[PDB]
Amino acid sequence: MLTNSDREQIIAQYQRGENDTGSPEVQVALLSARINDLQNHFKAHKADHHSRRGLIRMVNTRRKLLDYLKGKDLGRYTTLISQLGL
Template identity: 55%
Template sequence: MAITKEKKQEIIDSFRREEHDTGSPEVQIALLTARINDLTDHFKTHKKDHASRRGLLMLVSKRSSLLKYLRLTNRKSYLEVIGRLGLRK
């Protein structure tokens, strides 16, 4: 259910700005998206897992906040991230 260490490192490597970057908004959005997709698959089989659903909603809210921040500070990077992750339009 959780993201493996290798998968997490792969996501960080593909979205980071520089070599030791692990906390930029782009990386955080990509990691949250991976967790959200994982939880979405989980809910296809566990429809009544409301505790995890609450966690999913918190992750979606956090990602939304990060996307808003990125949109306001670095529009080019925002458009690149949503294009690569397949978010929004």
């Protein structure tokens, strides 16, 4: 998984405001970290379809938040995807 410590590290890096932990930036960053970490699990467990269902839902949620953020403020979206390599 991701520990509480590195989850809070990601939160702190992408804080738009003080202890917000809810903006599209921090949400997308946390989803990105979780997906990139779960890649390790699914390389060793290819037939884990029940877990892959949740990972696909993570991908879908990140895509929804990225499109919403792009439609809201395009500078923030172009900055966020550049930071996250998307």
